[PDB]
Design a protein around this ligand. Structure first.
Ligand code: SF4
Ligand SMILES: [Zn+2]
Ligand SMILES: [Zn+2]
Ligand SMILES: [Zn+2]
Lengths: 677, 380, 191
């Protein structure tokens, strides 16, 4: 309906408005009027998007000059499609309640693989070759040679779009990716090209983080779209990790082997400008020198170029000309396809990065591999250390960048992890007719022994027996699925092996089915499917996984799926690989961040992220348990999101397994009664 | 605004005086208004019913050994089931109850589908000392119930009640196909769980049209059972539904006459002990079979033996008594004696029947509308 | 044969019934296991007469009751009287010794089974059932002659006062009358 905010009226598709949504709208309007950045925290994945879009539309209607372009970067494609359909529902509601159309355009952006109509490139599963084949089929040389109408197979969507799709605009009608594909195939145009032509004359647009955090594509996709624009990163509790990974590259034997294989073909094509032909040939041996050197670690971000300018004595300036060479020399060579060519491009990108960005980075070489440490595997990784590098181009080009997610409990660490000036410090806790979650921390077991996942007690028999007993007697009180998270795959397998050794895992098996998540994508998918089908009926099942796994964030445990979420110990990242310690040192000597504080923050952030996916929707309910006494300390409880803090009473902070089971039984018994809306 | 933030209520303004003593009239009016606090209906709900073949499924897994309900779940469940059977047979004359117990991934038909209350109670009392082992199997229990109720007549309402204590069920095959088959069979399934909500039970109840509930305590358990006691509403006319049933007269035997003929009871003949060879009892109108308990379907000729008063006790719902017309005493120009109690009419209001135009006082009108259910004047 | 023998051994009562029905030629073994597997104005005149008689009514005291009437009423209401019949099978729990009682129960079970089969056959909707009911009647008559007649002779020899056979005769007579009536209807339907 029509909500009356202090200086505006906003139409809302839903007649009923929760107080949390109203307060969130108040705060967001305050931020928009403040013309500054900020950070938000909401506990519901659904219902945030509709309110955000409604307030954005209301603000655009009220102040067309203040806001012109909107960005709603999300994590994956399902979020993009769901926000697109939510915007479509909002627009339909506005049309039916108002009666007249508006000239607002909304499109979704993705990879060229997602948006393509050629049936010759869809079946293949090469994401690194689809773009190369698209460039080969249509490019500047293709356009030049199309004048004589050469009889050769090539893409023709652009050859029609440039003559028919560059004149007719799309002032009205928000279009989804499937809608864009349908329009392109009915008009004989490329969806990507029409999307590129239509972003300039558009109201809102959504895409992934990789189109803004990665500088190699953000400039191409966003250069002069709007000086005064609003961008929001929903579900960005791990924004620092993706920012770090944006400027992170890895090198192995395969890359150098591929480069040395393809340079011969490149030279053969060339012999059929010279400033780079001889320049590229001798670059390989400098990095292959570390292959033959058996050393543990070499760190010299500033001195790496100094050492490069000694073995071959090369100036640092021409490195800056490498990247601009990619768009110049390669198109002259008429590359057939980008296959067998990506490592050469990434080597140039790495060289440009080390030539330019060396103030807050580190070069790491590791002669270690999993289960085959020292055979032949010197891995060089130019790991980034500061998350501010990937966030400057969006803070300096935008006005009201907002970072919101389901877990942003410490609002004082994000503004200092990355250069940020928050003006909000706002948190919201959802309320319903009944308490939909019952968090509790289980300390010592029935033997009055702590069940902490301490490193020195990982092999301890007593803690494993207590964990098994807790999982057994817990599996008989909460039905149809329990999701358990462990610290690591090694610890998980060592625990399940010990459980199998004793006559205890059979007791859990006869109650619920056990499914183990592995690194295989297909195996994980089929395990998830069979877990879902087993939880559909009354059989019930247990899904054992790891906090730092692709399954932790890849799926959402909606109601009736995983009524209980168990945290077996505080999930601590492994201190090895000499990558975490470098970041800890950088934060210590630069941002004055305590190492223990940052480790606890990361551990609790991961724990809350993997435990907060059991509550999706107002009607959804679930149980959350932490099987570690270390959670009992205030320094870790304070890192939990505010919407879970108030429900974590001091009564159940160190209770044993039996009383935790009793509390779970009471909560589940009292939550099954009908509630109203 | 708020209802309590306005003006303070002054309820004492109702009473007034005009002759320095008129308060007696006001208190008499209050006393008169105190009566007639009922809707002239003992039930006020469903005015009809339909024959129900109800199957009760009882979990026999280890979860029944839990002591949530003193002393354990099994004993309290069986006691409340005995109470439910008694009340259900009291409020349903021609209904039938079957009992199935699920244990060790199998289902055992503890009692045949019949209308005898004593047999069900005896079986339940015997089942108190059973052994709780294994896990329940909803698929097998529902398959047995469907197989038994597949051949039942369409006019009867087929209902299945499941008391699911354990949260896990072992299904030898897919259960949703069985749920679809039950939906095609028009079988109503209702589940009363004990621990928590289970997805399969909710889906089954929603698809079969039944209701799914979860027990909070023993009182809530009894309330749910009492709610399940009431028969479902029935359509006005479905089919040619009838049943051939007899009305065995309770003919006892006395040695004074020459027809003192002892006879062993058919029900007692199957007992291990010596069957009661009493003087007389209930003789079947068709094959002269002797029975001691009613209502019991005849073992020999298959006839149903029912007691006529039990059927007749619900006949007043078919022909409810119309509310009498309230008339002030002054405006009635006739006799001032109640036609029912012969008492003098002194109340401010007199009730007159629309049929016989007699006079009934407040007490007699309430008695007729609540208990008698028939107008004494209309009888004449 | 071996399968059939084990069934009889597990239930000696059925084995006794099997001998009492098959060995005694009452029924064949084939059929045995087949089932196992007012007036005129005078009323107004009387009404007027009683109205006139009660028009002049005077209460009476002596005529209401007499010593003889009270004594007779007490004797009737005394224990052992007509309304207070105290016999009612005085010691039937110990009368007709339990050896006969077990045989009586066996006969009751056999008659109940045969009548259950007969009533399951009823009503006869197919010509196949017509012969089956005749066979059931023949089996009933053979069983009666084989068992009840010696049973009646034993009862008469021991002079038991209880009419145990009377109820069995009542059921058998009722079944025979029902079969005769149905046969009469069948003859009438063909007319
Ligand atoms: S131009 Fe468009 S349609 Fe043609 S190959 Fe590239 S992505 Fe596909
Ligand atoms: Zn009968
Ligand atoms: Zn009266
Ligand atoms: Zn009347």
């Amino acid at each position: 309906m029509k909500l009356n905010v202090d200086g505006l009226l906003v139409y809302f598709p839903y007649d009923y408005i929760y107080p949390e949504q109203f307060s969130y709208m108040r705060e967001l309007k305050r931020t928009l009027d403040a013309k500054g950045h900020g950070v938000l925290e909401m506990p519901s994945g659904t219902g945030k998007t509709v309110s955000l879009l409604a307030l954005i539309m209301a603000y655009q209607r009220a102040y067309p000059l203040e806001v012109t372009k909107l960005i709603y970067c999300s994590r994956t494609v399902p979020e993009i499609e769901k926000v697109i359909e939510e915007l479509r529902k909002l627009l339909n509601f506005y049309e039916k309640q108002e009666g007249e159309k508006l000239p607002f355009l909304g499109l979704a952006l993705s990879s060229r693989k997602n948006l393509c109509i050629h049936p010759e490139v869809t079946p293949l599963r090469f994401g690194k070759d689809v773009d190369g084949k698209c460039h080969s089929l249509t490019a500047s040389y293709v356009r030049a040679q199309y004048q004589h109408d050469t009889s050769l197979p090539h893409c023709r969507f652009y050859e029609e779009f440039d003559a028919h799709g560059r004149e007719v605009p799309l002032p009205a009608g928000i279009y989804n990716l499937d809608d864009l594909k349908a329009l392109g195939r009915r008009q004989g145009w490329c969806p990507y090209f029409l999307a590129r032509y239509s972003i300039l004359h558009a109201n809102v647009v959504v895409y992934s983080y990789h189109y803004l955090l990665d500088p190699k594509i953000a400039d191409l996709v966003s250069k002069e779209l709007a000086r005064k624009a609003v961008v929001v990163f929903d579900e960005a509790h791990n924004i620092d990790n993706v920012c770090i990974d944006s400027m992170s590259v890895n090198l192995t034997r395969r890359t150098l082997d591929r480069c040395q294989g393809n340079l011969e073909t490149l030279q053969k094509t060339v012999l059929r400008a010279e400033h780079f032909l001889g320049f590229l040939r001798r670059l390989l041996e400098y990095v292959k020198w570390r292959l033959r050197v058996q050393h543990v670690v070499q760190e010299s971000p500033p001195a790496f170029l100094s050492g490069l300018a000694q073995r071959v004595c090369i100036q640092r300036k021409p490195l800056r000309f490498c990247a601009e060479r990619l768009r110049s020399l390669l198109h002259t060579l008429e590359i057939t396809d980008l296959a067998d060519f990506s490592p050469l491009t990434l080597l140039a990108n790495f060289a440009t990065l080390v030539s330019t960005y060396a103030k807050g980075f580190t070069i790491i070489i590791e002669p270690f591999d999993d289960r085959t440490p020292t055979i032949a595997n010197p891995i060089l990784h130019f790991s980034c250390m500061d998350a501010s590098l990937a966030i400057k181009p969006v803070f300096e080009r935008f006005q009201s960048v907002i970072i919101t997610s389901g877990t942003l409990s410490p609002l004082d660490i994000y503004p200092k992890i990355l250069d940020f000036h928050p003006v909000t410090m706002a948190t919201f806790t959802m309320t319903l007719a009944r308490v939909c979650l019952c968090p509790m921390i289980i300390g010592r077991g029935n033997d009055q022994v702590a069940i902490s996942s301490k490193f020195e007690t990982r092999e301890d028999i007593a803690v494993i027996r207590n964990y098994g007993n807790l999982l057994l007697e817990m599996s008989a009180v909460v039905p149809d699925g329990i999701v358990a998270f462990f610290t690591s795959y090694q610890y998980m397998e060592s625990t399940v092996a010990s459980w199998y050794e004793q006559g205890i895992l059979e007791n859990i098996q006869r109650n619920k089915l056990l499914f183990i998540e592995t690194q295989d994508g297909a195996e994980t998918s089929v395990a998830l499917e069979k877990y879902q089908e087993a939880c559909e009926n009354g059989r019930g099942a247990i899904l054992l996984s790891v906090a730092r796994g692709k399954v932790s964030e890849g799926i959402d445990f909606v109601h009736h799926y995983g009524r209980a979420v168990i945290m077996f110990g505080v999930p601590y990242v492994y201190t090895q690989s000499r990558i975490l310690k470098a970041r800890l040192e950088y934060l210590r000597d630069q941002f004055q961040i305590r190492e223990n504080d940052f480790l606890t923050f990361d551990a609790m952030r991961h724990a809350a992220q993997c435990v907060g996916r059991a509550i999706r929707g107002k009607t959804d309910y679930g149980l959350m348990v932490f099987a570690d006494k270390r959670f009992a300390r205030g320094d870790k409880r304070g890192k939990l999101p505010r919407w879970i803090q108030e429900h974590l009473t001091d009564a159940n902070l160190n209770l044993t397994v039996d009383e935790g089971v009793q509390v779970a039984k009471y909560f589940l018994r009292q939550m099954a009664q009908p509630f109203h809306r | 605004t708020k209802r309590w933030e306005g003006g303070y209520e002054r309820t004492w303004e109702i009473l007034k005086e005009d002759e320095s003593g008129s308060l007696k009239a006001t208190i008499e009016d209050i006393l008169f208004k105190a009566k007639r606090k009922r809707v002239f209906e003992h039930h006020g709900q469903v005015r009809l019913g339909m024959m129900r073949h109800l199957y009760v499924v009882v979990d026999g897994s280890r979860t029944m050994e839990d002591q949530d309900l003193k002393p354990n779940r099994l004993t309290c469940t069986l006691k409340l089931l005995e109470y439910f059977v008694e009340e259900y047979f009291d409020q349903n004359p021609i209904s039938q109850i079957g009992i199935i117990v699920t244990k060790s991934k199998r289902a055992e038909k503890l009692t045949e589908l019949s209308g005898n209350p004593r047999k069900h109670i005896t079986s339940l009392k015997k089942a108190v000392d059973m052994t709780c082992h294994g896990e329940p199997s909803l698929y097998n229990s529902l398959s047995i119930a469907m197989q038994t109720l597949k051949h039942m007549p369409g006019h009867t309402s087929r209902e299945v009640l499941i008391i699911f204590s354990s949260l896990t069920t072992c299904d030898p095959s897919n259960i949703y196909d069985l749920i679809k088959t039950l939906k095609a069979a028009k079988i109503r399934v209702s589940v009363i769980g004990l621990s928590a909500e289970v997805r399969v039970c909710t889906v089954l109840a929603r698809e079969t049209g039944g209701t799914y509930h979860v027990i909070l305590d023993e009182s809530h358990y009894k309330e749910l059972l009492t709610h399940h006691v009431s028969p479902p509403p029935a359509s006005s006319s479905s089919e040619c539904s009838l049943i051939r049933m007899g009305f065995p007269q309770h003919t006892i035997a006395s040695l004074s006459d020459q027809d003192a003929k002892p006879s062993f009871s058919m029900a007692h003949l199957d007992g291990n002990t010596e069957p009661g060879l009493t003087l007389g009892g209930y003789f079947c109108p068709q094959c002269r079979a002797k029975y001691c308990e009613l209502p019991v379907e005849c073992k020999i000729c298959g006839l149903t033996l029912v007691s006529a008063p039990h059927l007749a006790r619900s006949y007043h719902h078919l022909f409810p008594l119309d509310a009498f017309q309230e008339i002030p005493l002054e405006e009635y120009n006739g006799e001032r004696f109640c036609y029912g109690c012969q008492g003098e009419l002194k109340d401010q209001h007199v009730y007159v029947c629309a049929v016989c135009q007699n006079v009934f006082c407040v007490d007699c009108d309430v008695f007729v509308h609540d208990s008698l259910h028939c107008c004494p004047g209309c009888i004449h | 044969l071996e399968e059939k023998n084990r069934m009889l051994q597990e239930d000696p009562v059925l084995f006794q019934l099997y001998k009492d029905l098959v060995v005694s030629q009452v029924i064949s073994a084939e059929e045995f296991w087949a089932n196992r597997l007012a007036t005129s104005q005078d009323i107004i005149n009387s009404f007027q007469s009683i109205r006139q008689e009660m028009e002049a009514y005077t209460p009476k005291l002596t005529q209401v009751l007499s010593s003889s009437a009270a004594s007779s009423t007490i004797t009737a209401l005394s224990p052992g009287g007509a309304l207070m019949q105290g016999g009612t099978q005085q010691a039937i729990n110990q009368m007709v010794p339990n050896d006969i009682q077990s045989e009586l129960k066996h006969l009751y079970v056999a008659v109940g089974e045969l009548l259950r089969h007969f009533w399951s056959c009823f009503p006869v909707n197919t010509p196949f059932l017509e012969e089956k009911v005749v066979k059931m009647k023949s089996n009933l008559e053979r069983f009666q002659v084989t068992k009840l007649c010696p049973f009646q002779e034993k009862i008469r020899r021991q002079y038991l006062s209880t009419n145990l056979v009377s109820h069995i005769e009542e059921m058998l007579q009722t079944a025979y009358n029902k079969l005769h009536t149905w046969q009469s209807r069948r003859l009438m339907k063909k007319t």
